[PDB]
Amino acid sequence: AVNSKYHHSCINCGGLNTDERNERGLPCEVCLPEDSPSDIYRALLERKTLKEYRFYHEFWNEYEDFRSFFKKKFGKDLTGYQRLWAKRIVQGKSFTMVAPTGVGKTTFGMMTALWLARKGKKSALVFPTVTLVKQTLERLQKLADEKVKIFGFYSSMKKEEKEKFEKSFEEDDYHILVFSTQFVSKNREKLSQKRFDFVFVDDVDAVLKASRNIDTLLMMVGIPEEIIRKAFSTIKQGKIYERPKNLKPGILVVSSATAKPRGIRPLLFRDLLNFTVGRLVSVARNITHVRISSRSKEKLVELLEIFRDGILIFAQTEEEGKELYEYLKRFKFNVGETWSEFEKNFEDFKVGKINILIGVQAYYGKLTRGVDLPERIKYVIFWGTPSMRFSLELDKAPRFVLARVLKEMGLIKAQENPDVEELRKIAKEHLTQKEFVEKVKEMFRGVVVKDEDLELIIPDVYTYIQASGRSSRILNGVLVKGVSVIFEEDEEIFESLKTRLLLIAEEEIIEEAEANWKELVHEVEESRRRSERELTDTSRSLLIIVESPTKAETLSRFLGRASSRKERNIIVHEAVTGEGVILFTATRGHVYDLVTKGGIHGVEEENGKFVPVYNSLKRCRDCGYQFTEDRDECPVCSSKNIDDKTETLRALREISLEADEILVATDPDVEGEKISWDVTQYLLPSTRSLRRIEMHEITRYGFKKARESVRFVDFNLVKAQIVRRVQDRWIGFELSGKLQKRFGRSNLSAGRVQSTVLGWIVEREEEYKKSEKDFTLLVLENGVNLEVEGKIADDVVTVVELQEAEEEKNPLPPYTTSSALSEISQKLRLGVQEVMDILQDLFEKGFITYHRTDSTRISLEGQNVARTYLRKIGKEDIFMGRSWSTEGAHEAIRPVKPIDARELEEMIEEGLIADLTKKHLRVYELIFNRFLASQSAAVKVKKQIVTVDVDGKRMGIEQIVEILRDGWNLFVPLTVSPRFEHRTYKIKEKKFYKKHTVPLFTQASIVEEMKKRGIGRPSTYAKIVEVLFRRGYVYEDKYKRVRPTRFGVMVYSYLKERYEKYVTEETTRRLEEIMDKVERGEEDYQATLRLLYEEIKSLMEE
Ligand SMILES: [Mg+2]
Ligand SMILES: [Zn+2]
Ligand SMILES: [Zn+2]
Fold first, then answer.
1. Which pick of 71, 170, 197, 830 has the fewest CB atoms within 10 Å?
2. Which ligand approaches the C-alpha of residue 101 most closely?
């Protein structure tokens, strides 16, 4: 427990409670002075202070009642899906059923309607077919008790029962109504005037067929047509509609959408019932991808004798498809075809007659629209990578082919005017066929350019994935194991396919040699027979919490976001995986922060120790002002459009009641840990199952391996964060006020580091003029220019000493935050804050590792990434794996997927991936190259150290002349210089000036320095630098050099003349070091707090 207080943490009164009490699960001392009570509910009942815990107690009560009921009526207990479902149904939330078929959807609908009818509430069950009405009714009548009133309507209805139904429905007195969609579409107004408390839809597609049915259901749950028309108008407008808080709605449940939920009508559910009708898209796949070096049919047969039953073949075209058809039909295997008898052999294979079914790339990826049974297909064979081909001549080259060329050449920049004839003309005029193929193969990266057949090959990754997925699916709550074998002789196609497969599906392909066959087959058949056995349920619901929406957006992609619930201030997306359901939501920043209300600026002292007092943040969307105070209107713009984080907290606590285990996945640094604890402390009294995972990569591998290393909230990190925060608050406020005494402006001093840095710049403005010394440039004949002392007049250079050596050149270490923020803001004309934004963007999108790092460590994973890229590029021999530094928390900034920037641009042009801007791509190119250089072999060169004589003054200079063997120079350019002899050279033109020995500061220089002098940490640099500009203490110029303004110089001069002991570097580095010692648990928390308080106590009295 970190000794702190939180403003809106109490579970029962909602007021202020401490940290430890919420850590355990107890309300505040106002609600409950008892330290170790027997029961919270009972003890709060006896104190007459039970206010909000009643909701939780009765929640678990009613839920456990539901669970016992379902466990008694049905055979076994609720499953992992029905658990979340039940925990949602006792709250009265409307949602979408995200699950495969056969896990008890209809069953759960019936039992829910039965329980709710048992309580006294009336419900309705809508079905697509009348046969399902009859069946559901059948199952209900023989499981419902006599006290329940069940009625139904269908086409072939009994003579007296058909009118009995009408008479019953007319009475407005029922408990459960069961009918078709036809009934709803026909009896719109008849159903609109009734009011239910529960509605179940076993098929949402039939209902979504008409628009009037949506309004019908919304009128059935308890919403008037006027509010419906209003919301309809608002969503027609384009903006969302706030649901009236005074509205008490019913319960609507829909099965997963099979098609695409187009229309303006579905959004009504999103804005009124707080849920989206998401369609079931399951990326749940357990497929092993293996590739064979050639189209050797002998190997094919050899594998066919191992796989036996459960094989599927995909051939290039129907011609060669018929060729292989004939081949294996003549070798006497169980042959099949889907271009002639696509329906007969389908079911023949389905039963067990045919063992191997052969198809074509497009003939089966489109003509399996029936059922497509994945419990028979265990192995999918690809005879040639699924790809598209384009001829490159005069014509036949598509729009994009000429586009990418000419755009970089010089004709189509004119607002991108598309005209094929024109493309042909330009092709005739400027390019010859040779030059054309050259330029195309030069520009187009990531694809396969065949100059031989004049064909451009693009591996259809989508087709390969959709086809491969037919060997793996969630069958009876168990994800069977698939096997996909590719027969591709050309390494280029296989490599392209492998990269764009690693890009989307995040799946890899192994060579034939590194694959155990009998083992894999055994595992497949084992998964099959394990799926066949009686399903003892294992599915679970899972909750993941992130601090930024971007993260959740990029998680949804490789998780499989189907539906999206909107909970209060936040939006939580749900995805179906193999292990069960996974819920992920965004917090959008911090939740708690120190309040300036009372205490030492923000922290209250009691019993010697220090106690920070926090509160929920509110950011305005209009002006953008953030404040911790519990205001209704903004103190700046006086507008109500604020973003209260206590709403986010309450929402999260509501959601935590649904999930079984909850994981927090914030940033691996101290900030993310502080946030993680700020959340877990709030959720702890609710659900006692909270853990912490640290994702360094936002990918499948990153997520999974972050989960494999799951831990609890380390308190040292949190303590360090609190220490730094408190220091910033105290010192910042003190120096701010002391500056208010002298200049008048309110907010001035931001902290200590800011003062130190501004001091550096100010003193730099002085030590830049005095370091101005005379120099002259000397362009030498048949050599290079040479910079020397001011005034020379001998017009000759005499080489005195010359020696050559063969050194091996090692590359520069991988990008850390210092390296990146420096060299990227240098090579590009970008500010450090902007570069930091780009870095964070690349990280959260899942292209680079965690950017806030100060170590050069590289796991064998990243090394393997480098080696695999080099393997693709054809130059794997120049690879050298370097750990660089064993000690270090995070890996250095490196690309997570072996894909160069050009390949990425291609993937975006094609239409696969990104919302990536140009600067994003360039920065990624920078990191990619620096990293690969840091993972490539050393460069053998030959450098000479020449001591020349210019104007009677000996002067040495070392230079690289020749490159013996090329290594890492393929990524980072290594410059070579003309050789030097042991003779005398003539000076062509002397150029006299006086460039300063100590040049002025740049942003990259500032970062370089506060890294060098040990001031700050990766999560502060760009912030600290930007603070100077934002306050108005610093400006840039022609050379984009950092110069202090009049104001800044005045401020630092004043601070220097008065309070220097609190600004001096020797104290700043000391404090930073001590806090970093707190970060590891090597220095006391409360003690350092006491120190800060002491020096603050000293400073304040001036
Ligand atoms: Mg069903
Ligand atoms: Zn309380
Ligand atoms: Zn505002």
1. 170
2. 1
